[PDB]
Amino acid sequence: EFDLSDPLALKKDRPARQSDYDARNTISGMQKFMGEDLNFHLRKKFQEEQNREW
Amino acid sequence: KNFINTNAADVIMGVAKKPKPIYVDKRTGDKHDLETSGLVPKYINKKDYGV
């Protein structure tokens, strides 16, 4: 149990979501959601070009 | 208004502000309160004691 009194754990600690795409971001770990919208801007511009040709 | 007169009278006709007592535990400087801890006798002084 040296890790509980470790003075370098916060130095050698690594975040729960370091990047957007990583392996440990499943549904029980609640750092990843589906409603966060990425690819919203591209959906908006796709809809607007369809509106133009329409 | 005499501030030089009244600032003298503000401190004499009063009371000192007594602290909440504290004990420092370790050489690092860990400071606790004294009454809440189980050290000083406080609870045998109750009126419910021994009856």
Partner: protein, 427 residues
């Protein structure tokens, strides 16, 4: 060993039960066809709490899915995890409830209550020592609020000594779907005080405030609000599924939270919620769980405890951590502010520590807190029951299913008594 039979009813109950069972199966390592593809051994040890066994190593859940229309559970049979639910557990009726408490309680759901009771009695006596049951429903609807309270009333006549829970979704004056949710909520919250051991409170206007002020989502859906409900639904039953330094089942939190048998309306909150852009500025440490879990901006009810007094407070930690730094932060909160804590209890807070964190995460915590601020939830609903009721607003819908106006009259003098029950400790 210690089984949990899951019951859920309504569109709100089924869309929560579709997301809770996805969380558990990722936590126990279950792929969407049934088998086990995990990596540890602790994932397969206590798996009979939720999953029954079948032939060929296939684990299917202990759920009963109830409704009154068929169109809700075709989107549950056709989702990602629609193939693991055993298809005889689905119970559906052909004509709905139509936002009516009466029609689901006396006419349409009186012919379907005895159809579900064959399913539960079949399978809750396949267990070896059933701990208790669980409901998840909506008080603002017609099926869960009218017939889900009918199943609660029937199974507490047959299995009395066990546990009942509800993750009830009481309505909201701000986020208001229907017009007639005052009548459905008031007639059901009188059915909750006599027949449930524990009962939480969930407002969709308080789940919105988490997805806008904490997780910063641009377009939250109902598929994100069900993620947060199911956060506080596995984190409560998490110490009889995994070992720990200090265990606590569902009954040990019932003993320590409710003083009097008519005072059991808690309100939840979950500790490591973090936005995407605020992700690398955080430290995953024990002080930073116990201090956002206690935040009034975090709670899963639309009532704030800065108006009332905390009767009791629970906390269920997960993850390998130190018992000294868990215990010093409960004394640190109880002593700074002795105006929000009741006096005839000297130590209000309970702690239990599991071992296995949520999958893909390091630490976690949950809050199950009993307050006298929960009475403003009822009187912001009972101020719109008697607003409608003095003019006999929508009453012809309800009287035609065989009730009387006395059933409407007793259900606010039972609701106001509980309001004045939680009131005498507020000062």
């Amino acid at each position: 060993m210690r089984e949990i039979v899951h019951l859920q009813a309504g569109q709100c109950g089924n869309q929560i039960g579709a997301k809770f069972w996805e969380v558990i199966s990722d936590e126990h390592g279950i792929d969407p066809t049934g088998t086990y593809h995990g990596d540890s051994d602790l994932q397969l040890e206590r798996i009979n709490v939720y999953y029954n066994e079948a032939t060929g190593g296939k684990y299917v859940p202990r759920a009963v899915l109830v409704d009154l229309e068929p169109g809700t559970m075709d989107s549950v049979r056709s989702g990602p995890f629609g193939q693991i639910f055993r298809p005889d557990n689905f119970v559906f009726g052909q004509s709905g409830a139509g936002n009516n408490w009466a029609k689901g309680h006396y006419t349409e759901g009186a012919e379907l209550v005895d159809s579900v009771l064959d399913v539960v009695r079949k399978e809750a006596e396949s267990c070896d020592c059933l701990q208790g049951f669980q409901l998840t429903h909506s008080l603002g609807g017609g099926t869960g609020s009218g017939m889900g309270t009918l199943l609660i009333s029937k199974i507490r006549e047959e299995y009395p000594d066990r546990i009942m829970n509800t993750f009830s979704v009481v309505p909201s004056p701000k986020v208001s779907d229907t017009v007639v949710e005052p009548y459905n909520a008031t007639l059901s919250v009188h059915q909750l005080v006599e027949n449930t051991d524990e009962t939480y409170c969930i407002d969709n206007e308080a789940l919105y405030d988490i997805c806008f002020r904490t997780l910063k989502l641009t377009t939250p859906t109902y598929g994100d609000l069900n993620h947060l409900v199911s956060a506080t639904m596995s984190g409560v039953t998490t110490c009889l599924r995994f070992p720990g330094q200090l265990n606590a089942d569902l009954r040990k939190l019932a003993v320590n939270m409710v003083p009097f048998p008519r005072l059991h309306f808690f309100m939840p909150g979950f500790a490591p919620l973090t936005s995407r852009g605020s992700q690398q500025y955080r430290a995953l440490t024990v002080p930073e769980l116990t201090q956002q879990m206690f935040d009034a901006k975090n709670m899963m009810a639309a009532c704030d405890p800065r108006h009332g007094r905390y009767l009791t407070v629970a906390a269920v930690f997960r993850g390998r951590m130190s018992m000294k730094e868990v215990d010093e932060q409960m004394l640190n909160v109880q002593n700074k502010n002795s105006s929000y804590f009741v006096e005839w209890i000297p130590n209000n807070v309970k702690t239990a520590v599991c071992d296995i964190p949520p999958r893909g995460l390091k630490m976690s915590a949950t809050f199950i807190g009993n307050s006298t601020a929960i009475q403003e939830l009822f009187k912001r609903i009972s101020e719109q029951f008697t607003a409608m009721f003095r003019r006999k607003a929508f009453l012809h819908w309800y009287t035609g299913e065989g009730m009387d106006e006395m059933e409407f009259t007793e259900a606010e003098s039972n609701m106001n008594d509980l309001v004045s029950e939680y009131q005498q400790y507020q000062d």
